[PDB]
Structure 1
């Protein structure tokens, strides 16, 4: 099944990419925010923390946009499936090459 497999694989790979985003520094000197706090003072390491915040915000925004587009496509497919049910299943449809 191709249609039912893409909607799961795409979500799983989006979640995996979201997890992978936390392994990057986004141009900072470390990936985990605890390391810079333990090795540098908070007054000096503020800019690295803020850079990490901006990177995580950008990744989350991109994930939200991708999920919104996927949800719109799923909404369109669900409307199509509901119409197909109400026409071909709950009666006989005169539309040729639709059912």
Structure 2
């Protein structure tokens, strides 16, 4: 209190109907553009030759209009199929397809009706205020390599924590958030802790 993608369809269709209406005032090489003024001041044998040029021109006008409507309806159908797919995948579910339902991690969507269309309101999560840390692939302890179950090992400069990858929430490294696999002599970048 924007909608140009909907105003474009309205404008293109009115602009085609106006051209179709206005081609009804060309002679196409006849004496008059109005059929009654050929019928009133001519007799059938010579009215016919003038009427045929008007028929030829107006038929071609009409055919051009119908072909360009058929090409434009096929573009509107692709749009409506995409909007049906967004209604199923963004309003009736949560999507993982990147950029399909807005920019960021999709949370939910709400539909709204428009004059010949639909407006989706996409709610997304956008991470903010990032900080720097030191990382390591694995920890070495007792000659064993430890990997995080779900997260990353981070250091604040002096201490090592595990955190989830999208929100900073540091916790102690225990045998409940890690698992073991192998020795600490094969992986490139193990640190001791």
Please tell me the TM-score bracket, short chain as reference. Answer: over 0.9
- Deviation of 1:43 (Å): 1.2
When you count helix as a share of all residues, which structure comes out higher? 1
Question: Cα deviation per residue 1:54-88 (whole Å; 9 max; x = unaligned)?
Answer: 11110000000010011000011111111111111
- 2:13 corresponds to: 11
**Matches of 2:50 and 2:88 in 1, distance apart?**
56
**Matches of 1:25 and 1:90 in 2, distance apart?**
57
- Deviation of 1:28 (Å): 1.0
Q: Give the number of aligned pairs.
A: 99
* Higher relative contact order (Cα pairs below 8 Å, separated by 6+ residues): 1
When you count strand as a share of all residues, which structure comes out higher? 2
Question: Cα deviation per residue 1:9-54 (whole Å; 9 max; x = unaligned)?
Answer: 1111111111101011111111111110101112112111111111
SS at match of 1:54: helix
TM norm structure 2: 0.50
SS at match of 1:96: coil
**Matches of 2:100 and 2:48 in 1, distance apart?**
60
TM norm structure 1: 0.96
Which runs of no fewer than 5 residues in structure 1 stay unpaired?
Answer: none
Larger radius of gyration: 2
**Matches of 2:4 and 2:27 in 1, distance apart?**
36
Which runs of no fewer than 5 residues in structure 2 stay unpaired?
Answer: 102-193
- Deviation of 1:5 (Å): 0.3
**Matches of 1:42 and 1:90 in 2, distance apart?**
68
RMSD of equivalent CA atoms: 0.8
